Amino acid sequence: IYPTVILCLFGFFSMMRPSEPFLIPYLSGPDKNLTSAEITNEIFPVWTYSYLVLLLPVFVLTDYVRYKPVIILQGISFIITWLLLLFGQGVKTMQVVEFFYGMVTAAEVAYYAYIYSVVSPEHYQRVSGYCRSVTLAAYTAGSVLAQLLVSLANMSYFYLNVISLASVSVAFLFSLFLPMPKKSMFFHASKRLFYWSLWWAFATAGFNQVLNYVQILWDYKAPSQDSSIYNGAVEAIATFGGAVAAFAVGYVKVNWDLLGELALVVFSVVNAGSLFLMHYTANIWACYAGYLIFKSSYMLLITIAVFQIAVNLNVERYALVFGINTFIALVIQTIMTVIVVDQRGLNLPVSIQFLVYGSYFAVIAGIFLMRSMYIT
Numbered sequence: 210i211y212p213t214v215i216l217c218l219f220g221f222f223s224m225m226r227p228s229e230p231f232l233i234p235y236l237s238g239p240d241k242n243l244t245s246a247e248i249t250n251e252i253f254p255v256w257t258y259s260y261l262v263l264l265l266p267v268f269v270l271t272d273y274v275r276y277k278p279v280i281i282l283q284g285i286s287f288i289i290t291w292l293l294l295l296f297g298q299g300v301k302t303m304q305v306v307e308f309f310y311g312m313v314t315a316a317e318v319a320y321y322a323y324i325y326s327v328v329s330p331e332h333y334q335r336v337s338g339y340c341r342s343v344t345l346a347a348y349t350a351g352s353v354l355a356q357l358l359v360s361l362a363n364m365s366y367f368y369l370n371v372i373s374l375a376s377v378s379v380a381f382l383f384s385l386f387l388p389m390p391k392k393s394m395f396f397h398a399s400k401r402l403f404y405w406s407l408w409w410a411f412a413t414a415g416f417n418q419v420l421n422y423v424q425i426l427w428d429y430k431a432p433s434q435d436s437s438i439y440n441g442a443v444e445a446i447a448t449f450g451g452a453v454a455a456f457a458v459g460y461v462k463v464n465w466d467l468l469g470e471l472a473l474v475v476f477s478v479v480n481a482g483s484l485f486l487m488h489y490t491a492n493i494w495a496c497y498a499g500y501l502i503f504k505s506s507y508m509l510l511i512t513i514a515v516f517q518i519a520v521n522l523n524v525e526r527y528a529l530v531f532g533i534n535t536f537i538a539l540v541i542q543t544i545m546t547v548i549v550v551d552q553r554g555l556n557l558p559v560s561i562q563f564l565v566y567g568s569y570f571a572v573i574a575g576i577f578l579m580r581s582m583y584i585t
């Protein structure tokens with residue numbers, strides 16, 4: 210339990226980042242003078258570009274070099290990423306910081322697969338669920354902290370970014386004397402399987418692309434320079450809703466395989482409707498409610514998808530299934546980025562971008578409904 214508690218506390222201090230909600234308001238604020246167009250069209254696409262570039266090498270070398278070094282590399286990457294965010298300036302600096310954040314988010318697979326070697330060959334699911342709950346609770350606490358500080362304390366985003374850097378610093382410091390694994394997973398390595406994997410890849414590509422730009426539409430619909438902004442509380446409530454949706458899907462005892470296609474198409478439709486509510490609204494409270502609804506209804510879909518895909522295959526290659534699924538998901542997301550939002554592609558601003566995102570989520574549901582009418 211001692212490696213478990215070190216991993217738990219490292220995840221808590223690494224995922225409690227108050228600078229995550231107020232990123233673009235901080236990026237586009239008086240501290241750095243970054244216009245929205247240059248952020249959207251150059252800074253953020255390189256994040257998913259580098260994340261795809263570094264997803265396969267990190268996942269393939271995290272067993273060769275064992276799990277702890279990649280976690281300490283994630284800590285170093287957090288340190289350098291937030292050092293560039295706090296002090297670096299320009300646009301090339303903000304592409305380098307996204308390149309580092311790609312590896313930051315790519316080392317999460319190694320962070321999650323480390324716990325395979327510390328407690329039991331079969332209790333992987335329970336401890337991984339505990340670590341997931343700890344990370345989501347850390348994110349919720351960080352968002353509540355950020356919103357509460359900005360609202361009551363009236364505290365500048367530079368000092369809030371300093372707080373996030375200090376948090377990831379303590380997280381890295383609580384990750385050197387991590388018990389180095391002696392157990393390595395490997396050295397040199399149905400009708401529902403491929404179908405549900407394609408569904409998961411599509412849904413998570415759409416989610417990773419929308420999560421990158423909800424903040425940009427948030428300060429587009431209502432400017433962050435004036436009239437206040439409520440990013441942190443909305444993000445905290447949204448991730449709390451996602452967590453309770455996951456826990457509710459796991460908690461309820463029902464035969465999903467009898468008819469899950471209907472109960473999941475009616476959730477993909479709700480996701481598409483929430484995206485269209487994002488795009489077509491004039492207010493910002495409606496957009497915040499749409500974000501709440503969308504992320505709750507998407508975490509429902511993902512918890513269902515991991516429920517059916519987990520029970521089919523063994524725990525040992527359960528991580529390999531996700532490793533070969535998220536690579537396809539990021540390929541889909543990089544084509545989606547290079548045509549939709551990249552400057553060298555079609556150069557769509559955020560204004561006419563959620564229409565395309567809702568069209569994506571509607572086309573996925575239309576393909577699902579077409580698959581149901583195969584007999585007809």
Ligand SMILES: Cc1ncc(C[n+]2csc(CCO)c2C)c(N)n1
Binds near residue numbers: 290444
């Ligand atoms: C350093 C850095 N932070 C965040 C993102 C994008 N991003 C991923 S998740 C998330 C929270 C949802 O608002 C955000 C903003 C980035 N590209 N680089």
